[PDB]
Design an enzyme around this catalytic site. Structure first.
Site, short mmCIF file in Angstrom:
data_model
loop_
_atom_site.label_atom_id
_atom_site.label_comp_id
_atom_site.label_asym_id
_atom_site.label_seq_id
_atom_site.Cartn_x
_atom_site.Cartn_y
_atom_site.Cartn_z
N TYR A 58 -89.02 -103.90 44.50
CA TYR A 58 -89.06 -103.87 45.42
C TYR A 58 -89.69 -102.65 46.02
O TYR A 58 -89.51 -101.65 45.45
CB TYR A 58 -87.52 -103.69 45.59
CG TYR A 58 -86.32 -102.63 44.60
CD1 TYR A 58 -86.17 -102.46 44.17
CD2 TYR A 58 -86.33 -101.53 45.92
CE1 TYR A 58 -85.43 -101.17 43.68
CE2 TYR A 58 -85.52 -100.36 45.63
CZ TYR A 58 -85.56 -100.17 44.29
OH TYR A 58 -84.90 -99.45 44.12
N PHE B 11 -87.86 -96.02 52.08
CA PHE B 11 -87.60 -95.22 51.50
C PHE B 11 -87.79 -94.87 49.90
O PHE B 11 -87.25 -94.44 48.99
CB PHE B 11 -86.11 -95.16 51.84
CG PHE B 11 -85.53 -95.94 51.90
CD1 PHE B 11 -84.76 -96.85 50.31
CD2 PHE B 11 -85.30 -97.32 52.83
CE1 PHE B 11 -84.27 -98.02 50.04
CE2 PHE B 11 -84.66 -98.41 52.69
CZ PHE B 11 -83.66 -98.56 51.76
N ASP B 12 -87.75 -96.50 49.27
CA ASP B 12 -88.48 -96.43 48.44
C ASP B 12 -88.61 -97.58 47.04
O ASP B 12 -88.97 -98.61 48.23
CB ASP B 12 -87.12 -96.16 46.98
CG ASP B 12 -86.59 -96.13 45.60
OD1 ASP B 12 -86.93 -94.92 45.15
OD2 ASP B 12 -86.07 -97.06 44.94
N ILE C 3 -75.52 -102.65 46.44
CA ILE C 3 -74.62 -102.99 47.81
C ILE C 3 -74.37 -104.26 47.78
O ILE C 3 -75.06 -105.02 47.49
CB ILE C 3 -75.89 -101.60 48.79
CG1 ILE C 3 -77.46 -102.45 48.71
CG2 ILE C 3 -75.56 -100.59 48.12
CD1 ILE C 3 -77.83 -102.06 49.57
N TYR D 293 -74.89 -98.62 53.10
CA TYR D 293 -74.35 -97.71 53.13
C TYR D 293 -74.10 -97.33 54.23
O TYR D 293 -73.41 -95.61 53.95
CB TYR D 293 -75.64 -96.64 52.60
CG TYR D 293 -76.36 -96.84 51.49
CD1 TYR D 293 -77.09 -97.63 51.71
CD2 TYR D 293 -75.45 -96.50 50.63
CE1 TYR D 293 -77.76 -98.05 50.17
CE2 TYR D 293 -76.10 -96.33 48.76
CZ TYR D 293 -76.84 -96.84 49.21
OH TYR D 293 -77.85 -97.44 47.53
N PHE E 18 -85.31 -104.60 52.70
CA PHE E 18 -85.46 -104.65 51.80
C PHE E 18 -86.97 -105.61 50.72
O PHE E 18 -86.67 -107.04 51.46
CB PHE E 18 -84.87 -104.80 50.17
CG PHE E 18 -84.03 -103.09 50.28
CD1 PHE E 18 -82.91 -103.12 50.48
CD2 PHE E 18 -84.12 -102.84 49.25
CE1 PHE E 18 -81.81 -102.11 50.72
CE2 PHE E 18 -83.43 -101.11 48.81
CZ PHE E 18 -82.43 -101.81 49.75
C1 LIG Z 1 -82.77 -98.18 41.64
C2 LIG Z 1 -80.83 -98.11 42.28
C3 LIG Z 1 -79.99 -98.97 43.41
C4 LIG Z 1 -79.30 -98.22 44.26
N1 LIG Z 1 -78.02 -99.68 44.35
C5 LIG Z 1 -76.64 -98.62 43.95
C6 LIG Z 1 -75.83 -97.87 44.13
C7 LIG Z 1 -75.98 -96.95 45.44
C8 LIG Z 1 -75.41 -95.74 45.01
C9 LIG Z 1 -75.04 -94.94 44.64
C10 LIG Z 1 -74.46 -95.97 43.58
N2 LIG Z 1 -75.03 -96.83 42.92
C11 LIG Z 1 -78.53 -99.73 45.22
O1 LIG Z 1 -77.43 -100.86 45.66
C12 LIG Z 1 -79.62 -99.66 46.08
C13 LIG Z 1 -80.31 -101.70 45.67
C14 LIG Z 1 -80.24 -101.55 44.45
C15 LIG Z 1 -81.71 -101.06 44.11
C16 LIG Z 1 -81.54 -99.98 44.27
N3 LIG Z 1 -80.55 -99.18 45.62
S1 LIG Z 1 -81.13 -97.97 46.74
O2 LIG Z 1 -82.57 -98.91 46.74
N4 LIG Z 1 -81.22 -98.24 47.91
C17 LIG Z 1 -80.95 -97.29 49.17
C18 LIG Z 1 -81.72 -96.43 45.75
C19 LIG Z 1 -80.23 -95.52 45.77
C20 LIG Z 1 -81.01 -94.89 45.00
CL1 LIG Z 1 -78.78 -93.66 44.79
C21 LIG Z 1 -81.52 -94.00 44.19
C22 LIG Z 1 -82.51 -95.19 44.39
CL2 LIG Z 1 -84.55 -94.34 43.26
C23 LIG Z 1 -82.69 -95.92 44.99
#
Ligand SMILES: C=C[C@H]1CN(Cc2ccccn2)C(=O)[C@@H]2CCC[C@H]1N2[S@@](=O)(=NC)c1cc(Cl)cc(Cl)c1
EC number: 5.2.1.8
Length: 107
Positions: free
Chosen positions: A26, A36-37, A56, A82, A99
């Site tokens: 992604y 952002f990522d 999420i 979020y 995304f």
């Molecule tokens: C790479 C990890 C997940 C993180 N999460 C789950 C999540 C979010 C916040 C705290 C704990 N778990 C997610 O639900 C979402 C969507 C899936 C892809 C990533 N994220 S993310 O891109 N959301 C802004 C994210 C969020 C974090 Cl904390 C780090 C990174 Cl590398 C990327």
């Protein structure tokens, strides 16, 4: 909620099921704004298990609608992401996220 717009079709038959490991690449950005990522930047696909509250809400519901090989744009409202507080250092308060997601395989 989450809107799924197909970029490239998948097989139209093989969808994530509860308890499977979903394997994706992604890129995430604020809507019509800054990235952002990206898992692609780490040369490592992202995995999560469906049905385990690991992601999420917009991901959980959005990616579940995708078939293997599909690429799609998921637009996720803040209440499906979020919410009112965001996430420190990466997502602002009250942010709509977009995304680009490619469903690579189910493991
Ligand atoms: C790479 C990890 C997940 C993180 N999460 C789950 C999540 C979010 C916040 C705290 C704990 N778990 C997610 O639900 C979402 C969507 C899936 C892809 C990533 N994220 S993310 O891109 N959301 C802004 C994210 C969020 C974090 Cl904390 C780090 C990174 Cl590398 C990327």
């Amino acid at each position: 909620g989450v809107q799924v717009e197909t970029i490239s079709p998948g097989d139209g038959r093989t969808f994530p099921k509860r308890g499977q490991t979903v394997v994706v690449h992604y890129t995430g950005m604020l809507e019509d704004g800054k990235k952002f990522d990206s898992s692609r930047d780490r040369n490592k696909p992202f995995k999560f298990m469906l049905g385990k509250q690991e992601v999420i809400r917009g991901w959980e519901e959005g990616v579940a609608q995708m078939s293997v090989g599909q690429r799609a744009k998921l637009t996720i409202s803040p209440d499906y992401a979020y919410g009112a507080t965001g996430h420190p250092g990466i997502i602002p308060p009250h942010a709509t996220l977009v995304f680009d997601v490619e469903l690579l395989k189910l493991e």
